[PDB]
Design a protein around this ligand. Structure first.
Ligand SMILES: CCCCCCCCCCCCCCCCCC(=O)OC[C@H](CO[C@@H]1O[C@H](CO[C@H]2O[C@H](CO)[C@H](O)[C@H](O)[C@H]2O)[C@H](O)[C@H](O)[C@H]1O)OC(=O)CCCCCCCCCCCCCCCCC
Ligand SMILES: CCCCCCCCCCCCCCCCCC(=O)OC[C@H](CO[C@@H]1O[C@H](CO[C@H]2O[C@H](CO)[C@H](O)[C@H](O)[C@H]2O)[C@H](O)[C@H](O)[C@H]1O)OC(=O)CCCCCCCCCCCCCCCCC
Ligand code: CLA
Ligand code: CLA
Ligand code: CLA
Ligand code: CLA
Ligand code: CLA
Ligand code: CLA
Ligand SMILES: CC1=C(/C=C/C(C)=C/C=C/C(C)=C/C=C/C=C(C)/C=C/C=C(C)/C=C/C2=C(C)CCCC2(C)C)C(C)(C)CCC1
Ligand SMILES: CC1=C(/C=C/C(C)=C/C=C/C(C)=C/C=C/C=C(C)/C=C/C=C(C)/C=C/C2=C(C)CCCC2(C)C)C(C)(C)CCC1
Ligand SMILES: CCCCCCCS[C@@H]1O[C@H](CO)[C@@H](O)[C@H](O)[C@H]1O
Ligand code: OEX
Ligand SMILES: [Ca+2]
Ligand SMILES: [Cl-]
Ligand SMILES: [Cl-]
Ligand SMILES: [Fe+2]
Ligand SMILES: [Mg+2]
Lengths: 37, 342, 29, 38, 34, 451, 62, 334, 81
């Protein structure tokens, strides 16, 4: 467990590792916005 | 001569987003019901009364384990029509008896007929030779041999494949244990046709893609092709030299190449079908008699063939009681075949 | 439970929101 | 009314996110309640 | 200019209508407990 | 928007990053932002692991891969690898996570705001792929950096607490390394060892003195090589041997990474020194051997004379000989006789497993350990159901050794594929036919027929 | 001290979210680059300060 | 030209009936060695103690096998991953008993086929072609590596590498299913999508091209004579093929770009087979197929079987029977 | 093209979404209720988790006669008290 002081951030800490994957999907959102030119 | 038939013919062949055709009258309802039956069964319907299995999302199965399962063995080869003598018009009871299995099998069969008729009809309208339908004869031989003839040869529909991922896996293993199907030269020719087909697909695609003429300025080379162009987009001569030097032989005739691409996987599937017709009757390639005579007399003689048979014996004994519940098998622990420790 | 989902909602919206803001502002996409 | 007002890239993004959410729910369901082995 | 109700419209809906219904059913199933 | 469509750049969107090949500023951006992604994952994943961490279950029962890496370095753990303080894990995680912000800031800046090309801005940071001297120079900076890294491992081991040593006398513990192996016959002796069974190449390293000394050698070698490449330009033979282009250099690096990935797969699978079984779980060999040990102990307690017990095949039921005569565990684990681990070694004498020590000297901790390892063998399903394929649901377990090995095999393979792709392409492009065959100059057409 | 910690940390998270959205939008935005640039300096400096504050306060709350 | 230079020019010559090349310089001796040893062993090798339990298995024709049952048998479990060349044996009789031919053959073969791939690159380069045919060949090659080298490495023994024979192949498959539940593994499933899909698309492309051949011949001659090697014009009408296929499904499901189409023909089976290989190569380290044994449970807690449980019973049969004399302890841990 | 309005026109129009922002959630909710009200069980005859066995029974309710199969299922159902 994290030190007690930080416990309120547990749900946040649970989500963070997946964030890099979000960058790959963002490339595709971006490209769609410029028509895959 | 402009009567109702010709007017209907006009309507059926309109160049629209999804072509209909006369064949569409057969194809569309039958395909729709087959897909819908499967989706409906795998989502909502049990196999508790026919197999003693959960088989739907509703019961807690996942995509790999859902199935529309075959009817109980006691149904024999009943068409199991909803208005039939078994279900008697009762939809709930019909689902519980496995009527969706025959619904899907039969509507699916008529649907495949519809699709091949569609290949013919469209070929005829557009003015091309009908080799696509011809090639589709192999899926038909497979579906008919595996889903109809095979269980018609056996005790009941129960032993047909059930429509599901894991259920199909069970079909594979059953065929190994009971039929020694990997030993069958018809199956083997099937394997050669499927893998040979995949090989041809890959090697042809890659060859075309790697003997392309530079027909544009871009480093991405897809745009440098035009559907209407007269010219070959890649060099058959360079392809030929490369393969002649790499592998010793090469294609030189493109027409023969493409025909061969039809011939290989189509012929493979047809051969597999023939072997399954044999298995409908338990007419197996199970043993080599010479092997068995030698092995029975000589306790030091061992081949991969005898080893595989011991595996099959394990499969039959350990899977039968739950896989064939109508037989009410009770195999006491002490009769179960086992090697040391395991 | 709702917390984790809330996080992934703001975090998840962050990316598309950037593209949207630039698209509206005729930015250098 | 007329096609165009809602940009296609946004439609694809929202639809995609929806797809991700539902499949996510199904994977959660693999670990809870029926089919969970528990 | 363009029609609305076509053969294509019908095909599209015969697939899409049951699909969304089914997906709602399967979603509810995820909260069923033995 | 310079070069950001297919018509101007020559590359479709799905090969869009190839538009960056000659745009040093933006390419710098991509690299720095990617580094940011890596560091981000390290931080975030560490904090996730720590949040889910129960200090009194073994790490390997909890799906941890980064905490084991930290604990191996001697941080947070004590005798036998028990967690005594989780604070260093927290520190490692938070610090990586914060650094990732700095990296990403730089990456985004260079990628969309800064100079798109660096050459006009600075001769120092600017480069042409085809400038061999500049390439060897940047290469040199980076070699010095790597050397420093290896030396940081050394400094940890020798001056800042030491490392976790599964082989420590009296039981595994954190230990300061005072006498690193400097002798080149040992160090490079590992390099010339066969990779086959009982030898195992560099994967066979089984003590921290060798590990540390090895890192001293690699540190000095990398710094020296870095200096060498800063001070020189490629010799004629090298010039005629290689393709000199960005895509070529990338392909070379892909080959290197693939090789390294296969290597790491084998390391995590077989090695129990730099991947301590306390943190990662037992190796496959280890757990198999441990089963044998477990039943020898049980049956011998029952009164069995395990040395003379003939199994069904005629080979010893518990004990047999290796093809060179050493006493080893029997049954299928006969394959794993090269296994070595601190719980087993006290039973080993000059000719292998010793019957007297077996009969008289097996301690309760050895029995415990062998049970533990036998029942945490690296077998399990994709949905993390522990045990053989036929085991029922109940135990939520897939060994970290399996996760790491499988992941790195998949990655190494795809990286070999990438090497072939980019090497082949680099050749074709340097020669000028990567876009296809010239209809008016088809080479085969000017060649004599084969027959 | 605990309250100061809690507020500093929440502040850091919020500010990080603000920077994560605003920095790439600003960098790629045509108009108003001067005010944005200033704001990015300000935000970066404050961000660093907050990391250091949380770092220090950590040892007085745990 | 000096001698070394002439030799180099011959080796890399584009005019040899079969291309040699530098990769070929390694490929040729290795493939010959494996081939010659394999033929002699297949016909004449005595039985081999594959599982190291002094229970020799006969693989050769002269020792009671036919083409279907015959094999070159994997090396002994007593050997494990140890390198066992001829010169490590006290005698050829020993070498043979312990399964030495297997190691000789698979090592020479894997090297030689690796060189075959390289050689495909090399000739592509000498001929001014694009280079990626070799990448396609990486798919079957990786698969051979998986079953001959990676799986043994993971399991700790060449005795668990695939046997060089037909029935031995089936044995390997059945045991693999018992030990890894490969059918329930998504990488194997992608493999099947890859080969079924490949066969499908092969037939499809064959049939469409054949359907759209342009009339160039009479009825009393093969249509094949309507194509001549090296003619400049395409031999079928792709616009017609697409007109057909786009109407068979819908317009935007058919390819109108030949380059795109052929790329797809390359990619689908190649990627699928890459995953097949990775399935074997990761199950090598015992990360196995999905396990849903007793996943479905009723309100009291009774197990409600699914098709996954029936699969489990079959797998149990295989498991308890395989290598019936080789296990002394309750868990099969490799 | 074949005459019908291009899909990309349709699904980027305001009207499409005015209709479908109602029709799509409505169908989804209907499917949910189909399960949540328990109707699905009764329509298809799927056992609820408490209806596979009676309290002390451990034998599957396997159908064993073709023509009286319906009555057998009814009897099995009655046996769950
Ligand atoms: C090419 C592709 C073209 C495109 C595909 C088109 C698909 C069209 C769809 C067709 C559907 C066919 C349904 C066949 C049903 C069937 O057969 O149902 C089976 C019944 C026979 O009933 C069975 O009969 C058995 C034996 O009973 C007999 O023997 C018993 C034992 O003594 C008792 O005496 C008993 O009273 C007595 O009747 C058992 O009772 C079984 O439970 C019962 O199912 O035959 C019958 O209806 C009719 C039998 C004769 C006609 C069969 C021709 C069609 C099928 C050919 C397949 C060949 C099969 C041989 C295997 C190789
Ligand atoms: C430039 C080109 C260079 C290459 C050209 C050709 C060079 C020769 C070919 C190499 C082939 C090697 C085969 C053997 C691999 C192997 O058995 O590797 C295993 C070894 C480790 O060996 C093990 O190492 C162990 C060391 O642990 C020992 O020591 C430990 C210390 O903690 C423990 O105590 C442990 O219990 C104890 O046993 C033991 O010695 C074991 O007996 C021993 O088997 O890994 C290792 O050496 C290092 C890892 C090698 C990498 C694996 C290669 C994979 C290639 C895949 C190809 C894909 C192709 C796709 C085609 C398209
Ligand atoms: C149009 C394509 C088509 C085809 C080829 C089929 C084919 C089939 N359906 Mg399917 N079905 C379809 C569309 C189709 N269906 C549609 C659109 C629906 C939704 C309503 C269904 C819903 C459905 C259900 C619920 C079931 C079937 C079933 C069947 C099977 C049994 C059919 C039968 O016995 O008919 C018999 C009738 C005919 C063959 C009609 C022939 C017309 C004659 C020649 C004209 C003369 C009639 C005469 C004058 C009338 C006198 C009647 C009087 C004495 C009372 C068969 C495989 C059954 C099944 O699959 O069981 C497993 C089943 O239970 N179908
Ligand atoms: C690690 C993944 C990665 C990275 C670092 C890059 C980086 C880059 N890509 Mg590539 N790309 C990728 C994956 C990646 N790409 C993938 C997966 C695809 C396939 C979809 C592509 C397809 C592609 C194409 C077709 C092109 C690029 C181009 C580029 C370059 C210019 C980007 C641009 O002008 O956008 C402008 C975008 C915006 C203005 C929107 C916002 C962008 C920022 C970076 C988002 C930052 C969000 C982040 C959370 C902010 C945190 C800040 C905080 C630290 C303070 C840049 C160096 C272009 C190029 O080469 O031009 C020379 C180009 O044409 N990419
Ligand atoms: C080196 C890579 C690596 C390894 C060995 C692990 C290992 C682990 N992770 Mg970690 N993780 C990683 C990267 C890795 N992860 C990444 C990139 C993320 C961000 C998404 C995470 C975020 C994360 C979370 C949030 C959690 C884990 C957890 C775990 C544990 C359970 C994993 C599991 O059940 O997987 C399930 C298996 C899969 C999801 C299968 C993935 C199959 C991929 C998609 C195939 C890809 C093939 C190839 C790359 C594609 C090539 C395409 C081709 C055409 C070229 C296990 C120890 C869990 C845990 O126990 O924590 C304590 C957990 O909760 N990880
Ligand atoms: C390897 C990564 C890398 C490289 C090669 C560059 C290179 C450059 N940057 Mg960039 N940048 C980076 C990462 C990098 N940056 C990062 C991580 C950030 C976020 C902090 C930035 C933010 C940034 C801004 C805002 C600007 C630049 C600018 C520049 C240019 C001017 C450099 C100069 O004159 O410094 C002179 C040398 C020094 C000031 C000494 C630096 C002392 C370092 C930082 C101490 C640490 C060294 C140590 C080895 C680091 C190890 C890190 C590791 C643990 C990760 C130059 C092209 C300028 C530019 O492009 O103008 C047009 C500019 O305005 N950079
Ligand atoms: C020869 C290089 C080499 C080797 C064999 C190792 C090996 C090891 N390191 Mg060390 N290390 C190195 C360099 C190396 N390292 C460098 C450069 C750094 C700074 C980044 C470190 C920093 C470091 C840390 C902080 C730690 C380790 C740890 C370890 C151990 C576990 C990790 C592992 O499995 O890596 C496997 C190693 C590899 C996959 C690399 C093999 C490289 C091959 C042999 C050569 C490739 C050369 C290249 C392609 C050719 C150049 C081109 C030229 C010919 C023209 C393992 C014994 C851990 C440890 O010791 O725990 C106690 C640990 O905590 N290393
Ligand atoms: C990432 C690290 C790296 C990279 C990419 C390079 C790259 C290069 N080096 Mg440098 N070098 C490095 C680190 C590196 N070096 C270090 C750390 C040192 C200190 C030892 C040196 C000392 C050095 C010297 C003295 C020279 C180079 C030279 C070169 C250039 C030609 C090298 C070559 O042809 O290799 C290809 C390798 C060969 C041609 C060797 C023959 C082929 C054999 C059979 C390979 C067998 C290896 C085997 C498979 C490895 C497996 C493990 C094994 C140990 C058992 C090339 C630019 C040369 C140069 O041009 O200088 C100006 C040169 O003379 N380097
Ligand atoms: C650490 C931290 C942080 C950070 C964060 C971040 C860094 C974030 C990022 C974020 C992001 C970065 C996001 C992104 C997202 C994305 C998405 C969400 C996407 C999606 C996509 C899709 C859905 C797609 C679709 C499509 C298209 C578009 C086209 C084609 C088709 C398809 C369908 C595929 C914060 C601040 C919280 C604070 C605390 C701590
Ligand atoms: C270029 C480009 C790209 C990419 C990008 C990128 C990749 C970026 C990155 C970025 C990054 C890489 C970022 C990062 C960030 C980070 C952050 C922002 C962090 C923060 C942190 C914090 C805030 C912390 C907190 C805490 C503490 C301190 C304690 C404990 C708890 C917690 C966790 C809460 C793309 C693809 C889109 C495309 C276009 C172009
Ligand atoms: C099956 C088709 C049978 C056609 S029947 C045919 O139909 C015509 C109009 O279509 C009539 O004019 C004609 O008199 C009638 O014989
Ligand atoms: O060797 Mn051939 O098979 Ca792979 O697990 Mn263990 O070892 Mn034996 O038993 Mn199961
Ligand atoms: Ca309950
Ligand atoms: Cl066996
Ligand atoms: Cl054993
Ligand atoms: Fe073709
Ligand atoms: Mg559930």
């Amino acid at each position: 467990k994290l030190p007690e002081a930080y416990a309120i951030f547990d749900p946040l800490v649970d989500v963070l590792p997946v964030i890099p994957v979000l960058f790959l999907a963002l490339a595709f959102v971006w490209q769609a916005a410029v028509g895959f030119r | 001569e402009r009567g109702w038939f010709d007017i209907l013919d006009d309507w059926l062949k309109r160049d629209r987003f999804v072509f209909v055709g006369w064949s569409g009258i057969l194809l569309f309802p039958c395909a729709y019901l087959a897909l819908g039956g499967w989706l409906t069964g795998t989502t909502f319907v049990t196999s508790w009364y026919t197999h003693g299995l959960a088989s739907s999302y509703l019961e807690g199965c996942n995509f790999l384990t859902v199935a529309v399962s075959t009817p109980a063995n006691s149904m024999g080869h009943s068409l199991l029509l909803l208005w039939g003598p078994e279900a008697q018009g009762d939809f709930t009871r019909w689902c519980q008896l496995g009527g969706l299995w025959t619904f899907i099998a039969l509507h699916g069969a008529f649907g495949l007929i519809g699709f091949m008729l569609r290949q013919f009809e469209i070929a005829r309208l557009v003015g091309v030779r009908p080799y696509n339908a011809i090639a589709f004869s192999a899926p038909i031989a497979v579906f008919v041999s595996v889903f109809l003839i095979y269980p018609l040869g056996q005790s009941s529909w129960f032993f047909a494949p059930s429509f599901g991922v894991a259920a199909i896996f069970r079909f594979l293993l059953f065929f190994q244990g009971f039929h020694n199907w990997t030993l069958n030269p018809f199956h083997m020719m099937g394997v050669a046709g499927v893998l040979g087909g995949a090989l041809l697909c890959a090697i042809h695609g890659a060859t075309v893609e790697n003997t392309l003429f530079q027909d544009g300025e871009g480093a991405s080379t897809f745009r440098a092709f035009n559907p209407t162009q007269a010219e070959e987009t890649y060099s058959m001569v360079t392809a030929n030299r490369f393969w002649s030097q790499i592998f010793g032989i090469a294609f030189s005739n493109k027409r023969w190449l493409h025909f061969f691409m039809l011939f290989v996987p189509v012929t493979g599937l047809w051969m597999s079908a023939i072997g399954v017709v044999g298995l409908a009757l338990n007419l197996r390639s199970y043993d080599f008699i010479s092997q068995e005579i030698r092995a029975a007399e000589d306790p030091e003689f061992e081949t991969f063939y005898t080893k595989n048979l011991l595996l099959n014996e394990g499969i039959r004994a350990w899977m039968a009681p739950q896989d064939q519940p109508h037989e009410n098998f009770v195999f006491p622990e002490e009769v179960l075949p086992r090697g040391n420790a395991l | 439970v709702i917390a984790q989902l809330t996080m992934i909602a703001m975090i998840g919206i962050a990316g598309p929101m950037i593209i949207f803001l630039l698209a509206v502002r005729r930015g250098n996409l | 009314s007329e096609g165009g007002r809602i940009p296609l890239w946004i439609v694809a993004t929202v639809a995609g996110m929806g797809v991700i959410v539902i499949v996510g729910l199904f994977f959660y369901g693999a670990y809870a309640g029926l089919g969970s082995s528990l | 200019s363009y029609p609305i109700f076509t053969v294509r419209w019908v095909a599209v809906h015969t697939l899409a209508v049951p699909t969304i219904f089914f997906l709602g059913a399967i979603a509810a199933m995820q909260f069923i407990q033995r | 928007a310079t070069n950001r469509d297919q018509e101007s750049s020559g590359f479709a969107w799905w090969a869009g990053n190839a538009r960056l090949i000659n745009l040093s500023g933006k390419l710098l951006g991509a690299h720095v932002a990617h580094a940011g992604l890596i560091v981000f994952w390290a931080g975030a994943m560490t904090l996730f692991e720590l949040a889910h961490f129960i200090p009194e279950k073994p790490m390997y029962e909890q799906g941890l891969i980064l905490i084991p890496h930290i604990a191996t370095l001697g941080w947070g753990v004590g005798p036998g690898g028990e967690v005594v303080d989780t604070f260093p894990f927290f520190v490692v995680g938070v610090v990586h996570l914060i650094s990732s912000a700095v990296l990403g800031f730089g990456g985004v800046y260079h990628a969309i705001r800064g100079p798109e090309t660096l050459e006009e801005y600075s001769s120092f940071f600017g480069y042409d792929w085809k400038d061999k001297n500049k390439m060897t120079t940047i290469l040199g900076f980076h070699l010095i950096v790597l050397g420093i890294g290896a030396l940081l491992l050394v400094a940890k081991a020798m001056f800042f607490g030491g490392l976790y040593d599964t082989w420590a006398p009296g039981g595994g513990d954190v230990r300061v390394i005072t006498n690193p192996t400097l002798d080149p016959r040992v160090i490079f002796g590992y390099l010339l060892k066969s990779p086959f069974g009982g030898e195992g190449w560099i994967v066979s390293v089984n003590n921290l003195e060798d590990v540390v000394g090895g890192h001293i050698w690699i540190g000095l070698i990398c710094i020296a090589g870095g200096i060498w490449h800063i001070l020189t330009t490629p010799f004629g033979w090298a010039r005629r041997a290689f393709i000199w282009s960005g895509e070529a250099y990338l392909s070379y690096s892909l080959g290197a990474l693939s090789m390294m990935g296969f290597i790491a797969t084998c390391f995590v699978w077989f090695n129990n020194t730099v991947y301590p079984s306390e943190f990662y779980g037992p190796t496959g060999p280890e757990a198999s051997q441990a089963q044998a040990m477990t039943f020898l102990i049980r049956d011998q307690k029952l009164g069995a004379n395990v040395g003379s017990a003939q199994g069904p095949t005629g080979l010893g039921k518990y004990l047999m000989r290796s093809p060179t005569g050493e006493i080893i565990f029997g049954g299928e684990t006969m394959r794993f006789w090269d296994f070595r681990g601190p719980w087993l070694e006290p039973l080993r004498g000059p000719n292998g497993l010793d019957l007297n020590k077996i009969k008289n000297d097996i301690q309760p901790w050895q029995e415990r350990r062998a049970a533990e390892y036998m029942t945490h063998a690296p077998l399990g399903s994709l949905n993390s159901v522990g045990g053989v394929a036929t085991e029922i649901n109940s135990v939520n377990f897939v060994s970290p050794r399996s996760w790491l090995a499988t992941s790195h095999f998949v990655l190494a393979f795809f990286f070999l594929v990438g090497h072939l792709w980019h090497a082949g392409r680099a050749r074709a492009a340097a020669a000028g036919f990567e876009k296809g065959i010239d209809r008016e100059s088809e080479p085969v057409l000017s060649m004599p027929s084969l027959d | 001290m605990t309250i100061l910690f809690q507020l500093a940390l929440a502040a850091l998270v919020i500010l990080s979210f603000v920077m994560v959205i605003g920095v790439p939008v600003a960098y790629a935005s045509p108009q108003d680059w001067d005010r944005s640039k200033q704001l990015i300096f300000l935000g970066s400096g404050l961000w660093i300060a907050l990391v250091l504050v949380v770092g220090v306060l950590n040892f007085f709350v745990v | 030209a000096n001698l070394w230079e002439r030799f180099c020019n011959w080796v890399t010559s584009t005019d040899n009936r079969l291309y040699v090349g530098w990769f070929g310089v390694i490929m040729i001796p290795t493939l010959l060695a494996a081939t010659i040893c394999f033929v002699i062993a297949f016909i004449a090798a005595p039985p081999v103690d594959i599982d190291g339990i002094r229970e020799p298995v006969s693989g050769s024709l002269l020792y009671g096998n036919n083409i279907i049952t015959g094999a070159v048998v994997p090396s002994s479990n007593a050997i494990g991953l140890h390198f066992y060349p001829i010169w490590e044996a006290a005698s050829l009789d020993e070498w043979l008993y312990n399964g030495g031919p297997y190691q000789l053959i698979i090592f020479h073969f894997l090297l030689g086929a690796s060189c075959y791939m390289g050689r495909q690159w090399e000739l592509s380069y000498r001929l001014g072609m694009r280079p990626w045919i070799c990448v396609a060949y990486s798919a079957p090659l990786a698969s051979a590596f998986a079953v001959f080298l990676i799986y043994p490495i993971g399991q700790g023994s060449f005795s668990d590498g695939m046997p060089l024979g037909i029935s031995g192949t089936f044995n390997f498959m059945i045991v693999f299913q018992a030990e890894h539940n490969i059918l329930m593994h998504p990488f194997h499933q992608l493999g099947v999508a890859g080969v079924f899909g490949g066969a499908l698309f092969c037939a499809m492309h064959g049939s469409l091209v054949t359907s759209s051949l342009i009339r160039e011949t009479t009825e009393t001659e093969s249509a094949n004579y309507g194509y001549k090697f090296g003619q400049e014009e395409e031999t079928y009408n792709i616009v017609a093929a697409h007109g057909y296929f786009g109407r068979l499904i819908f317009q935007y499901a058919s390819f109108n770009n030949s380059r795109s189409l052929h790329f797809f023909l390359a990619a689908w089976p190649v990627v699928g087979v890459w995953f097949a290989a990775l399935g074997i190569s990761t199950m090598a380290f015992n990360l196995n197929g999905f396990n849903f044994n007793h996943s479905v449970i009723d309100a009291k807690g009774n197990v409600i079987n699914t098709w996954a449980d029936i699969i489990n019973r079959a797998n149990l049969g295989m498991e308890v029977m395989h290598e019936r004399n080789a296990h002394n302890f309750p868990l099969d841990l490799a | 093209t074949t005459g019908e309005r291009p899909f990309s026109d349709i699904i980027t129009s305001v009207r499409y979404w005015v209709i479908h922002s109602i029709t799509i959630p409505a169908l989804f909710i209907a499917g949910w209720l189909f399960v949540s009200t328990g109707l699905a069980y009764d329509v298809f005859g799927t056992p609820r988790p408490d209806s596979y066995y009676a309290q002390e029974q451990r034998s599957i309710p396997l159908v064993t006669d073709r023509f009286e199969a319906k009555q057998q299922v009814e009897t099995f159902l009655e046996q769950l008290k």
